[model samples]
Target: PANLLTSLVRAHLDSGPSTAKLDYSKFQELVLPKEDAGDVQQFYDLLSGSLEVIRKWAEKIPGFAELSPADQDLLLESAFLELFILRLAYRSKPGEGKLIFCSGLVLHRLQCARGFGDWIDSILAFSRSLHSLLVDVPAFACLSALVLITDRHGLQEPRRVEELQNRIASCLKEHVAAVAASCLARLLGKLPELRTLCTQGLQRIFYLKLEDLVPPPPIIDKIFMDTLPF
Candidate 1:
């Protein structure tokens, strides 16, 4: 399991396909959107577009492809924001406070703050702590996979999901090696913070949707409905 799965795991550590367009279509020269409408529109485009990358990338996770398509979709839908935040933290520059999207597009904290509201700053702060851990790419990849592999409210094959989660956890535990059992704790600890961040993101989206200055992206509406406490 270790040798074979590890090879596959290392293989898919690379990211992006047609899924990531270097073109900043809604952005030119990284110009800040002129209107709240444009900023919000840009925000959703960033998220919705990134979902394509997340969806396909998760499929490449060896054990993940065997999941029922429904289960796969549900996991992505449920943990979308967590993976978004995790990957963003790993990819971003918190010192300069720049936020990097999946497409390799970069924007300053000031650039999209208004659209993300407090949520953007919260992520910047989250990024700071995450980076402080000095987590490497392999461990980070495991964390990203774990985010989707764990329990969700309505998994069709919960036991199957847990079995896969255990294998990944075993791999992660082996990588941690000696010392720092607390390090493992610290890594898993991020999930609770990440869970709340997704709610904050959903709330920000909720306010924007309620404001109705721009119609919600249909993909957002779908994820929102699926993840809402109600």
Candidate 2:
């Protein structure tokens, strides 16, 4: 089931810098500290970088370029949060209860909670569950790609996108069938859970904006900025 293309996904992840090595017990536990928005800045920076990486990877998928540019953007916006969550889970160190940002900042669960509120808790829980599955690189890669290609409502070409989605999913299914019979079903079952987590992320953004403790930077994705009730 595992194949060269899937191995490429793992390779891309491994090629990145190692996760930050920060001791967890040293930081003071303060919730939503009003000092500054360094944490927010780091968070968006991670998201922005991840979006670029995902865009490059998407180019390699078959039929991706066949879609109109607008359709491609739509898919990326609708699916970026879920893709980000999956990547974070793969990179996370659950044993330390830490989120390893792409920028090499490691935030312990408590510190993340302080800045991100209970949303961190939800993400940590999802990350732990994902890790528990003990999914291999090939399986995880296919799964992540599948998330990006998933059909959403109001697509300009839903049928065409769905076909591409199915093609990607079939690779995952083949991988599972060859090596781990139960994995395909298990991975597919997680989609709804991932969607729920994405919803929570949106709400967390709204809550943070409402607090208005710090202004968001100019470079954060416009989709998120447009969602803010400001």
Candidate 3:
């Protein structure tokens, strides 16, 4: 359990497969959608699948399982969106202006409007800035782990979470060489932007649910479903 955080970080870093640009027709298929349902379906698949990965990664954190079941859920509820944006930014290739989902699905800036609605511009801008940092895998991993373990308002064990976050931060500092000082600083600077991005993402979700364009599936967690201020 002690090294679980490190292991999770490395796994994601090493797990990214070799990349090839999407073919023209396939790219067009994603960008030019014929049906709103198709757009919703693609969005749903990415959201749910991404959540599952986040869920699994958090559960694997050392001692996360030991938290009270309620606490576990609470932590997930508080941290999920932040971690989601962090991962999304990390995965995006800003040079290409594409958002790469866990399923290897790629969406260009033009498609963002249909898939993400009003929040697309902010997301793309953040992704561009994130990519501009030229972060190394280890640094990104540390930032991601830090994002997940940061202190949340209602954690049952806030101290424990802080402790874990500090450990990951220490790891980050150590792993990233001093020669890369600017890169590290740039990476750390993105945290506040990530917080804003998370809020934007939640707002997008709230708007979508309010419009009643499509009902969120049962797999959508209660924390998300129950938090609608709309």
Candidate 4:
């Protein structure tokens, strides 16, 4: 309904700069066809695209196995973070690499929060990729390690922007050259400067004890028969 009203207003506004001939009630009275008509299949497919990524992560991570049946729905929410980060990273500066770094932080936390320490490899891969893609190597490496340790005990979940803060601080603590370069980039494109904001944002964890990050159970093996009768 709001979209219809907005459309009607846009039509009237675009007709001319003047709104002399328009009536306020006309927008309320206008009816418009829904733009998404005949697109249910597309919608389902788009949602399935997100679902497939979840399945892939589930297939890879042990967190999926740790989840109780009642907690399964919450796992979907966690898996959604992967696609969410991917979408955000792809649209961001592909060459800069921080976007993916940030996304990897989110991915690692979401997976690890569910008790899958196996995601460490993934976290490192994203970090190493960022370095290969021209990001500061020391910074990426340090930040990646920071994320691995940020969750001291396994009692909490990471918030989105907070992980960025932790990663930035961790990197800064370990890599001076990279941090300086980040500062230089800040002067050029506001990215380096943003790092300070992220650093200042880190909150100390008060109650949780660091736990031994556990590995997931062994993988399931599926067998296929060749030329078997149906």
Cα-lDDT of candidate 3: 0.67
Candidate 4 lDDT for residue 79: 26
Which pairs of residues clash in candidate 3, taking residues 3 or more apart in a chain or in different chains? none
TM-score of each: 0.88, 0.81, 0.81, 0.26
State the local distance difference test value for candidate 1.
0.79
Candidate 3: where are CA atoms >4 Å away?
Answer: 1-8, 14-25, 29-35, 177-183, 226-230
lDDT of 3 by residue, 1-230 (tens): 22644675655654443466333333543443332766665666667767777777776666567766866776776667777667777787766767776656677766656757757678768888877777776677677767777766666787877777777777777677643466567778899888888787777676666766676677553656644434
Query: Relative to the true structure, how large is the alpha-carbon lDDT of every model?
Result: 0.79, 0.70, 0.67, 0.29
Model 2's TM-score against the true structure: 0.81
lDDT at 93 for candidate 4? Answer: 36
Evaluate residue 14 in candidate 3 and report its C-alpha lDDT on the 0 to 100 scale: 45
For model 2, how does the per-residue alpha-carbon lDDT over 48-116 read when each residue is reduced to its tens digit? 767666777777666777997888887777787887787777778777786776545566676655556
Per residue, candidate 1 scores C-alpha lDDT tens digits across 63-144 of 8879888899999899998888888877887998777777768677777777778888899999999999998766777788
On lDDT, the stronger of 1 and 3 is: 1
Clashes per model (N, Cα, C within 3 A): 0, 0, 0, 2
Clashing pairs in 2: none
Off by over 4 Å in 1: 1-12, 16-35, 178-180
Q: What is the lDDT of residue 151 in candidate 1?
A: 89
The positional error of residue 186 in candidate 2, measured at the CA in angstroms, is 0.9
